[PDB]
Design an enzyme around this catalytic site. Structure first.
Site, PDB file in Angstrom:
ATOM      1  N   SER A  24      34.075 -52.965 -35.989  1.00 38.52           N
ATOM      2  CA  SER A  24      33.837 -51.944 -34.979  1.00 38.52           C
ATOM      3  C   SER A  24      33.104 -52.512 -33.788  1.00 38.52           C
ATOM      4  O   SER A  24      32.285 -53.408 -33.914  1.00 38.52           O
ATOM      5  CB  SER A  24      33.117 -50.774 -35.567  1.00 38.52           C
ATOM      6  OG  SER A  24      32.447 -50.083 -34.566  1.00 38.52           O
ATOM      7  N   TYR A  57      37.596 -49.772 -34.414  1.00 35.51           N
ATOM      8  CA  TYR A  57      37.433 -48.559 -33.595  1.00 35.51           C
ATOM      9  C   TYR A  57      36.253 -48.738 -32.653  1.00 35.51           C
ATOM     10  O   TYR A  57      35.395 -49.579 -32.870  1.00 35.51           O
ATOM     11  CB  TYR A  57      37.241 -47.312 -34.487  1.00 35.51           C
ATOM     12  CG  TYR A  57      35.940 -47.288 -35.250  1.00 35.51           C
ATOM     13  CD1 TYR A  57      35.819 -47.918 -36.475  1.00 35.51           C
ATOM     14  CD2 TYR A  57      34.808 -46.643 -34.726  1.00 35.51           C
ATOM     15  CE1 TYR A  57      34.627 -47.900 -37.188  1.00 35.51           C
ATOM     16  CE2 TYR A  57      33.620 -46.623 -35.405  1.00 35.51           C
ATOM     17  CZ  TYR A  57      33.514 -47.250 -36.644  1.00 35.51           C
ATOM     18  OH  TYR A  57      32.306 -47.211 -37.314  1.00 35.51           O
ATOM     19  N   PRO A  73      31.828 -56.161 -40.525  1.00 35.31           N
ATOM     20  CA  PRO A  73      32.546 -57.375 -40.861  1.00 35.31           C
ATOM     21  C   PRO A  73      33.128 -58.088 -39.655  1.00 35.31           C
ATOM     22  O   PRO A  73      33.245 -59.292 -39.688  1.00 35.31           O
ATOM     23  CB  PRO A  73      33.649 -56.876 -41.803  1.00 35.31           C
ATOM     24  CG  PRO A  73      32.990 -55.761 -42.508  1.00 35.31           C
ATOM     25  CD  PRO A  73      32.221 -55.058 -41.408  1.00 35.31           C
TER      26      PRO A  73
HETATM   27 CL   LIG Z   1      34.563 -54.255 -38.822  1.00 30.80          CL
END
Ligand SMILES: [Cl-]
Ligand SMILES: [Cl-]
Ligand SMILES: [Cl-]
Ligand SMILES: [Cl-]
EC number: 4.1.1.11
Lengths: 107, 107, 106, 106
Positions: A24, A57, A73
């Site tokens: 993200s 996102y 991650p």
């Molecule tokens: Cl991620």
């Protein structure tokens, strides 16, 4: 019947931060505005330094901060200073007229 | 219900150029026309030499130039001379008539 | 909302061939059992090497048991590898649930 | 036009099992919390090793806290890894915004 086409692209977004254990991609809310990208929208993030390609996102960063931060991650796939392209796609009826992408060049 | 099906495929497209610091994939506009691929359409690009698989969008190249060029971070996933397949999909209601894919073989 | 859900899965498909200089070719009877059509996009995952890719389906001869990765996908398997082949559909999550067609080839 | 937006996110899901020769099994109460349904396609991202994959959801026993990667996905994790599990929905952006359902298991 639908096809996927480019909706928005931000070019030459410099990574300013990364946070593996996020609580993200965070993007300056004014840059998001320029690119017609909304909070929680899915984007493709590609990295000019290391070639990594991922989907995640969008999280709002503070307006005019120039924040571009990969969290979770995704932090493992970049370093500070890397240059990114951030791409959003849209599904459209191919019998409609072509979508004109919104292009934002940060270089 | 909707499913994704093959709409267009360009086979044996030879890479002619690559430019990391672009100001995606550039394809001869006549080849795009043969394949019913439009500017800014999302495509899967797969590489016979190195096995790389990626998704990006299409930029028009000059007509009849035979240009096939990977730009931006995608440049790190190929070399000049590599043979590509370039694929586009479409989402359809499968209770309708079959999409007959447009196949362009450049070999 | 429109979401992606599992519509078909072929489990334990054994790779019988690969041809770099040609997609996934699948015995047309197995395709029918899985409700997968010619040119449909599928996810192919490999139990031997962990590779995960998306490609489209080509018909193999009926009852041949042919499972072959062609083109650049050939670099991501070897003969004898076991695959799962998965197809998804986009649907309204509130409408009646899609019951996936499961085909176990082991 | 349709765009993809976040609908559900489970954060800090700890892997409890993996079974290569069975794809993600999730405690059915966690799924309910996240508004994720059986057979829904999800993105799974791993904080320990950075792996990113797409697979579909299988129901695990209620209140078991089961988080298990099955099939070829088993090669992309180890027990104890922390995952984020994400689902998206395609929407007309001129309609009302999807408020994502966020579940934090930390
Ligand atoms: Cl991620
Ligand atoms: Cl790129
Ligand atoms: Cl391929
Ligand atoms: Cl899997």
């Amino acid at each position: 019947m639908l096809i996927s086409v480019l909706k928005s692209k931000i070019s030459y977004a410099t990574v300013t931060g990364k946070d593996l254990f996020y609580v993200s991609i965070t993007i300056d809310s004014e840059i998001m505005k320029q690119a017609n990208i909304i909070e929680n929208e899915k984007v493709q993030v590609v990295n000019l330094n290391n070639g990594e390609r991922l989907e995640t996102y969008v999280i709002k960063g503070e307006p005019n901060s120039k924040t571009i931060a990969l969290n979770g991650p995704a932090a493992r796939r970049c370093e500070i200073g890397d240059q990114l392209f951030i791409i959003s796609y849209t599904q459209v009826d191919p019998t409609r007229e072509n979508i004109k992408p919104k292009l934002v060049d940060l270089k």
